């Protein structure tokens, strides 16, 4: 119960609300897996994909997704991104949270 809720799903104009509205309900904190990126390098989110590509944007995402699932385990409702499940190994570390007893959760033309 006191554990996190890993919210997978898409990105909308109101899908960032239910990530923090879930944080505000349980008295739990919130850590987005998108806005965590710009303070450790100092550069923007969209400035990293247009400069190198999808590869090292994923490799930077894959390393930082490990520790916040275990040292930010008890308390932050970890709002994960939209293209996280695009790769194979990020699909598998999500499934590691399932059988241990986690509450991994999905919140349901170009779009």
């Amino acid at each position: 119960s006191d554990k996190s809720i890993i919210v997978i799903g898409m990105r909308g104009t109101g899908k960032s609300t239910l990530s923090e509205w879930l944080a505000s309900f349980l008295g739990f904190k919130m850590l987005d897996m998108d806005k965590y990126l710009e303070e450790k390098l100092g550069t923007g989110i969209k400035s990293l994909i247009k400069a190198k590509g999808w590869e090292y944007f994923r490799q930077e995402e894959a390393i930082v997704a490990k520790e916040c699932f275990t040292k930010f385990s008890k308390g932050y409702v970890l709002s994960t991104g939209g293209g996280i499940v695009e790769g194979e190994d990020a699909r598998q570390q999500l499934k590691s949270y399932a059988d241990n007893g986690g509450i991994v959760l999905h919140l349901h033309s170009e779009v």
Side-chain angles (χ1 to χ4, degrees):
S1 57
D2 75 290
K3 286 181 316 293
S4 292
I5 289 94
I6 304 178
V7 176
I8 75 177
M10 278 219 85
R11 291 193 297 274
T13 43
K15 309 307 188 40
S16 159
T17 65
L18 280 87
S19 283
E20 55 204 340
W21 199 70
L22 173 55
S24 83
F25 173 69
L26 284 196
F28 274 33
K29 318 311 156 284
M30 186 270 287
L31 166 56
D32 181 17
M33 264 310 106
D34 301 298
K35 81 201 188 314
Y36 167 86
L37 281 64
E38 59 265 4
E39 70 258 43
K40 71 209 157 182
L41 271 73
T43 79
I45 299 188
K46 304 319 296 172
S47 86
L48 281 153
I49 173 67
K50 300 318 152 203
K52 212 270 182 173
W54 289 94
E55 193 50 277
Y56 199 47
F57 205 105
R58 171 167 169 82
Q59 306 329 289
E60 169 266 0
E61 181 259 350
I63 298 312
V64 303
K66 313 289 305 310
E67 71 287 347
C68 290
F69 281 21
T70 175
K71 183 178 179 180
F72 265 62
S73 86
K74 304 303 187 303
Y76 279 62
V77 176
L78 311 155
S79 157
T80 55
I84 178 168
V85 301
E86 258 285 353
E88 281 50 49
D89 57 26
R91 278 205 288 280
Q92 300 276 276
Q93 48 92 22
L94 262 173
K95 282 147 178 214
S96 52
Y97 215 83
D99 53 353
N100 302 7
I103 316 99
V104 293
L105 158 72
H106 172 232
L107 273 184
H108 205 105
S109 159
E110 191 282 309
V111 78

